[PDB]
C-alpha cells in the first residue's frame, strides 16, 4: 500500500492529473502546505 503527494498543488485541478488514476477516488484527500496528499487518513 502507498500514498501519493502532488507537491505544490492546490488540489482542485489534480482530479484530472494529466496514466494511473486508481487513487483519485480517495474520499480521504487532504491538503498540506507542501501540496496535496492522497491515500492517507488524518
Amino acid at each position: 500500500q502507498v500514498a501519493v503527494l502532488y507537491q505544490g498543488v492546490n488540489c482542485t485541478e489534480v482530479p484530472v492529473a494529466i496514466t494511473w488514476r486508481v487513487y483519485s477516488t480517495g474520499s480521504n484527500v487532504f491538503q498540506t502546505r507542501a501540496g496535496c496528499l492522497i491515500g492517507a487518513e488524518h
Binding site: 505544490g8 492546490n10 502546505r33 507542501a34 501540496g35
Partner: protein
C-alpha cells in the same frame, strides 16, 4: 526581554521579533515572483 511573549500568534520574544524583522527574505516560496 528573552522569555516568550504569550500575546503573539507565534510565541516569540522581543529580541527574536527584532531579529526576524531585520532580515528581508527574497523569493521565499509558498503554496501558490517565480
Amino acid at each position: 526581554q528573552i522569555l516568550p511573549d504569550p500575546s503573539k500568534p507565534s510565541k516569540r520574544s522581543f529580541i527574536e521579533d527584532l531579529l526576524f524583522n531585520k532580515v528581508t527574505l527574497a523569493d521565499a516560496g509558498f503554496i501558490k515572483a517565480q
